[PDB]
């Protein structure tokens, strides 16, 4: 028995602090979000299935506005997410205050990675047990996954949470950097179908995107999403036939 995950201040003898690698597991038991980044903009698609129908269709939320050109989604605790999404929005706007530049997706990511590392280092506070996806267009669409540890990983298309591993493998084959907005949105939607181990329901998923040619953040409308979802359900069905 262990004591390398009793508090964060202890390294295991293997060399690695286990307790922040156990905040990673916090994500895993939580529920999926996929970000699919193309050269037409970036897309972000995230769980809203959660719980019974006692709950409203808008189980707020996984799709946070971070600015007007940056969005983020999460997997992990939606408790721990809520404060981190506050910090993420205030930080982004502070950049706007002290520079008048729409924050670059890269620089935001780097600050939220530094803020987690505050919690990782100090033992008077536990790690964040939340992972974040930050998707934006600063002038080049860029997509990152921010780890519990305060770590930075760039992806072409990404997942976290329940479906993570299956999505990784679905995009391992099909994803290429060249796929249209229409293709990328539907492809990530098939992959999402797999993550929830059922056909999509267009009211169980919430989807935003940041476009290059607008440079604006927009939320896909319930019925505007519906034909995209329709063509994804055919494929989702095929693969659960096997």
């Amino acid at each position: 028995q262990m004591g390398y995950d009793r508090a964060i201040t202890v390294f295991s003898p293997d060399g690695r602090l286990f307790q922040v690698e156990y905040a990673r597991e916090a994500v895993k038991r939580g529920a999926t979000a996929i970000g699919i980044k193309c050269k037409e903009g970036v897309i972000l698609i995230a769980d809203k299935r959660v719980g019974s129908k006692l709950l409203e269709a808008d189980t707020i939320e996984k799709i946070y506005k971070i600015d007007e050109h940056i969005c983020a989604a999460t997997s992990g605790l939606v408790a721990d997410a809520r404060v981190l999404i506050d910090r993420a929005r205030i930080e982004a706007q502070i950049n706007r205050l002290t520079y008048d530049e729409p924050i670059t997706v890269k620089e935001l990511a780097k600050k939220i990675c530094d803020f987690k590392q505050q919690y990782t280092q100090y033992g008077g506070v536990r790690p964040f047990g939340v992972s974040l996806l930050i998707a934006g267009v600063d002038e080049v669409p860029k997509l990152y996954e921010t780890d519990p540890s305060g770590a930075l990983l760039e992806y072409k298309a990404t997942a976290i949470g329940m479906g993570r591993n299956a999505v990784t493998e679905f995009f391992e084959k099909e994803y290429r950097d060249d796929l249209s907005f229409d293709d990328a949105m539907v492809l990530g939607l098939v992959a999402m179908g797999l993550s929830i181990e059922s056909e999509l329901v267009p009211e169980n998923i919430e989807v935003g995107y940041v476009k290059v040619d607008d440079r604006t953040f927009k939320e896909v409308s319930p019925e505007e999403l519906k034909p995209y979802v329709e063509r994804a359900n055919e494929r989702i069905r095929e693969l659960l036939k096997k």
Partner: peptide
Amino acid sequence: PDLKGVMFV
């Protein structure tokens, strides 16, 4: 495996 809340989602 286990456990999706509630608060873990």
